[PDB]
């Protein structure tokens, strides 16, 4: 299954991330800045079907249970958000996509002077699919990423040709909580 472990924090607050056995990981976090922790693949694919089971999902603040990855050419950070805490992420509304039993809202946002895979202070577009209501957790779940890639394409949101990592993540900003996720 997975071959990659992602564990990044801007150093704000506490992010206690555990690289577990196989595709399993856990995070306990408190009063954070920006962070992203997850398991997945060093090289993303628009054709990948990601499976996971979030045995524990207990955010608050801005904390997302999300497919997370990058492309370059152009530099794009993308999300397929299945669940969240207190605040649901949104941006510029494009449309919707139905996939894996859920309806997701498609949004774009822009990050300025921000950390990325390309450096400490960079500018990049973010693509989002955000589930309309929180996905149930604790059972096996699939994200059929091709559905999202295709839907994004239809709204002129094209991904880059150079694929970086792709993980099923716990990601947050000004957030506290616990997660435990297995990815395959
Ligand atoms: O090979 C695949 C298996 O790995 C997959 O097994 C699932 C693995 O995740 C299990 O859920 C965990 C239970 O413990 C909690 O603490 C964790 O947070 C959960 O992730 C789940 O029960 C298994 O079915 O099944 C499909 C195979 O293809
Ligand atoms: O040397 C490089 C690493 O430092 C680099 O780490 C990336 C730093 O940017 C992170 O993106 C932020 C994640 O949090 C989100 O909320 C924000 O949108 C982003 O600013 C990214 O997760 C890290 O991978 O990785 C590549 C190395 O070359």
UniProtKB/Swiss-Prot annotation:
Pathway: Glycan degradation; xylan degradation. Changing residue 77 to S: Drastically reduced activity. It catalyses: Endohydrolysis of (1->4)-beta-D-xylosidic linkages in xylans. The keyword Protein biosynthesis does not apply. GO terms for biological process: xylan catabolic process. GO terms for molecular function: endo-1,4-beta-xylanase activity. The active site is at residues 77, 171. Pfam families: Glyco_hydro_11. InterPro entries: ConA-like_dom_sf, GH11/12, GH11_AS_1, GH11_AS_2, GH11_dom, Glyco_hydro_11. Its EC number is 3.2.1.8. Keywords: Carbohydrate metabolism, Glycosidase, Hydrolase, Polysaccharide degradation, Signal, Xylan degradation. The keyword Secreted does not apply. Residues 1-184 form the GH11 domain. Belongs to the glycosyl hydrolase 11 (cellulase G) family. This is Endo-1,4-beta-xylanase A. The lineage of its organism: Bacteria, Bacillati, Bacillota, Bacilli, Bacillales.
């Amino acid at each position: 299954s997975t071959d990659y472990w992602q564990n990044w924090t801007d150093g704000g607050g506490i992010v206690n991330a555990v690289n577990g056995s196989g595709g399993n990981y856990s995070v306990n976090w408190s009063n954070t800045g920006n962070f992203v922790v997850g398991k997945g693949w060093t090289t993303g694919s628009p054709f990948r079907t990601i499976n996971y089971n979030a045995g524990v999902w207990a955010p608050n603040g801005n904390g997302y249970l999300t497919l997370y990855g990058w492309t370059r050419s152009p530099l794009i950070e993308y999300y397929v958000v299945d669940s969240w805490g207190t605040y649901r992420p949104t941006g510029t509304y494009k449309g919707t996509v139905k996939s894996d039993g859920g309806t997701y809202d498609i949004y774009t946002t822009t990050r300025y002077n921000a950390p990325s895979i390309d450096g400490d202070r960079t500018t990049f577009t973010q693509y989002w699919s955000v589930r309309q209501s929180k996905r149930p957790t604790g059972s096996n779940a699939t994200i059929t990423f091709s559905n999202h890639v295709n839907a994004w394409k239809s709204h002129g949101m094209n991904l880059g040709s150079n694929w970086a990592y792709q993980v099923m993540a716990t990601a947050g900003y000004q957030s506290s909580g616990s997660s435990n996720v297995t990815v395959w």
